Design a protein around this ligand. Sequence first.
Ligand SMILES: Cc1[nH+]cc(COP(=O)(O)O)c(/C=N/[C@@H](CC(=O)O)C(=O)O)c1O
Ligand SMILES: *Cc1c(COP(=O)(O)O)cnc(C)c1O
Ligand SMILES: [Mg+2]
Lengths: 398, 398
Amino acid sequence: MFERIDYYAGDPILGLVEKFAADNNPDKVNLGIGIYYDESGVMPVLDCVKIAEQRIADPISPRPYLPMAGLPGHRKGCQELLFGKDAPVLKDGLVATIATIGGSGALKVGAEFIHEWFPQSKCYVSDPTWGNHIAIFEGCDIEVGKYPYYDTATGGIKFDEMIAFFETLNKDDVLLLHPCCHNPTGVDLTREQWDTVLNVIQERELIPFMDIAYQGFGEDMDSDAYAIRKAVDMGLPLFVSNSFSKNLSLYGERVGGLSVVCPTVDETERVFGQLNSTVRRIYSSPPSHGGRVVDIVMNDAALHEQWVGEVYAMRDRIKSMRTKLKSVLEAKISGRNFDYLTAQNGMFSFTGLTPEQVERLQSEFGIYMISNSRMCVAGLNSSNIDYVANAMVDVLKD
Amino acid sequence: MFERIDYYAGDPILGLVEKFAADNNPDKVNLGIGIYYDESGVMPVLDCVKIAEQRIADPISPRPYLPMAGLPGHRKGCQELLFGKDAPVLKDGLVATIATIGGSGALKVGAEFIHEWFPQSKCYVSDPTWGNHIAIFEGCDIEVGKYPYYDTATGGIKFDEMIAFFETLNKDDVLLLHPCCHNPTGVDLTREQWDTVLNVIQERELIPFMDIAYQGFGEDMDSDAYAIRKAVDMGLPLFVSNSFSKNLSLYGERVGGLSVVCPTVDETERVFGQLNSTVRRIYSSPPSHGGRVVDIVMNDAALHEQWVGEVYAMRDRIKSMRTKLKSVLEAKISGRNFDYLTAQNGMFSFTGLTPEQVERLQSEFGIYMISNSRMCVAGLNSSNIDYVANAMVDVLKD
Ligand SMILES: Cc1[nH+]cc(COP(=O)(O)O)c(/C=N/[C@@H](CC(=O)O)C(=O)O)c1O
Ligand SMILES: *Cc1c(COP(=O)(O)O)cnc(C)c1O
Ligand SMILES: [Mg+2]
């Protein structure tokens, strides 16, 4: 029956957790996973989630289908979070929004929608990007290309070539952009740079599709969304897929949102029904439990304020692990430039180690990273920071 | 930007919930939606489901990603329920099975797999069927048609027209089949009819896609799986999408499974592999909460054993509303025969009212059904059967 079917590409990450788990080094450190661990190196349960979940368990309720669009409040919660409490665009009702099965599901729905209505659009992703970007858009039959981003020569954005590359693009072509906290690089645009990029997206009539998955891991909630809020202010046909996976420690509960910012209330009505019809032919309606958590935390001002504070705690704990790392490297490689480590943001960092050095960390010291040089800065804490740091020193000098 | 996008007509039944919800009448009844209600007309929370979520809340635990395929346990419960505890097919390792976002997510993943791997196959569904079948398979770019099924003359199957239609189909054409409890009609194939279908499905080399959402609601768990197991014993390449929404009363939590039966271990690994790949590029991995409920109930023998009692309870209550409705009607319109109301199985019945008769039931009585005469029997209970039964006796001598 099925011998024509090829074996899958495979899970690059589980083959990586499997290798680490197997790794015999007692001092082993996993900087390879895409996940927040606290300073005790465990996945945190947030205090506000914990309260929300207590509410859900009292009383245990009947469990109807959620609307295809997800809970009214969940929907609002993504919107306020992304566009600002009581944003003009929200008052005028110019945004169509759905709850979604994570960021992933929001990517999937946006992509499927853009495939149905703009079957002529190619999509570009950044180079590099999270590989699931590509598999999701390719999964819909969109042509995926990449645009020039990480300058491997400098640790910086190759901004010029990037811009000029947008100049070559067609009406309605889609740009998958990271508003903050780049994955895999941690390398972010500046505001004045976002301002440039956006005028280009306006001038060539392109679609910006922003995938924001680390809001608050960056600078702060409001600031992290700058690109989004600018794009709105500029009349761009904005798509926004957003995720609560990392910033609620709710990865498994699959909570996310897709937003589409339209010109007029009537176009909003059109897009919205279509987002609904798309959800319907995929999975029907989103999971209740996750939905209630997002609903409760975002909309209960006290819990929201609590939430935000836990989020900044993580943002800050990362920043310290970041600065604590650079100080040990500069102390011991007197010549070198390590600024990029603290100039980066979010949960990831391109360390600028060569594939070979990354190999040597693993084989000599039990330290797992990805070979493009990506490390998960959250994997680091005080019980492992010296061990990693000195291990990096050994590999870097040689 | 989006002037060219169509209005989405909407999920046809939910706007009808709005119109009944709108209806002013004291004696309003809603028999249109597909939800199981208890003897008090309320959506229940199953006693075993209660226990499970008590466990999930204690302690509230971190929420990591489930594997792409869902919980190994969830996956097992699906498999055991459908093919039988420690079944030959399960021991041999020949069934590739993933947790899914509802049955709907099972149909979707299945459909995509068929689309990626058997791109010339057409899909056939029952005339009529649950609307979403078509919407889903059409949404993956498969061409959907109908096979002759329900007979308006008799309220029976058009069995001859059906096999005859089957005979005209090509190798690897897909048949969407309800193994029991057909939606919308309630009208089921007998065992010998089943063997006969499967025979034709064999001789013409077709693919059976068995979509089973009401296991336990027809006769009992095993009997309801008869076509599935038989096809297995037949060595056909079966796909089985199964849903826990109705029989765990967990609609909102989105818990289903997809199983594909293959000839060799090697084939299982390829196919199963494609399935995780397929999940990855739609939503990454399914919801933890629902997934824990299915895992827990399914594999705790006491809860599992409890759970089944609860289904059979539910099976019984519907069978009683079924017999009660016929008693009232058979007693009061002497000549014509209603055996179909109890010849039918599961949640739905095609009542045979014309749209003229159906409208009038809403217009004069406030009793809400689909225009095609589909009623949901579980919407009935001892407090309104007596009301509804008469509105029908009435609308019928018009
Ligand atoms: C035959 C059938 N198959 C699959 C599904 C998918 O259900 P899920 O909730 O994904 O497990 C349903 C749902 N039927 C409900 C209709 C609906 O979802 O709108 C119903 O009871 O009508 C079916 O009736
Ligand atoms: C982790 C990640 C997501 C995750 O979305 P989920 O589907 O909620 O896990 C989405 N987008 C990006 C860029 C990510 O890094
Ligand atoms: Mg497609």
